[PDB]
Amino acid sequence: GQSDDSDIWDDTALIKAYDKAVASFK
C-alpha cells in the first residue's frame, strides 16, 4: 500500500498539555 501512517496517535499530545496546565483554575 501507499503507507502514510504517522498521525495514528495524536502527536499533538504535547500541545494538549499546554491547555490543561493553564486551564488549572476553572
Next chain:
Amino acid sequence: GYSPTLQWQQQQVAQFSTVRQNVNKHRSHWKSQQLDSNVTMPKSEDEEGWKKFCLGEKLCADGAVGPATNESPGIDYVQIGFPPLLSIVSRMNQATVTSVLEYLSNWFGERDFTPELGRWLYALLACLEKPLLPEAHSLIRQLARRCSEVRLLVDSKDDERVPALNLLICLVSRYFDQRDLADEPSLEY
C-alpha cells in the same frame, strides 16, 4: 486543604513523566521514515536559520486579532509554517536550544513576557535530558526570577493568572530539585 497542596502539585509534575511516555510510542513510528517527511533543518553554521525556522516569522506578524491571521489566504501549510513536533524536536540537541536561549533574553521588554513562548516553554523541558550542565542549571534560575517581577506589577494578587503562575514555579523547584527556589516554611524550628 489550603496548606496540603501536595495533591494538586503532583498532577502538574506527574504530567511531565507522562509526556515522556508519549514520545517513546512515536519513536517506532518515526523510525519508519527519515527526517524528510516534513522537516527542513537549516545548515548548522546558519544560526539565523534555526531561530527563524524553529520560531517562524508568524510571531512577528502576530495572529489573533482577526484579519492578521488571514494575512496569507492561499493554501494552508504555507500560512501555518512548520510547527514543533516530535520529529523536529527529536533531532534537535539539548545544547542547540540552550544557546538560542541567549537571543530570547535579548528581547527583554521587562513588562513583556509574550504568553506565546509559554507553549514553546514546555518543549524546552522535554528537550532536556540526563543531568543539566553547570551552565544549564544557572540559566533556568535566571528566567524564573524574572517572572517574579511580573507579580509585583500585578495590582491584585487574586488576579486570575496568578494561580497558574504559582503552580508553574513549583514545577521547576521539584523536578530539578532546586530547593533554592523552593518556598520553604521556617525549618519548623
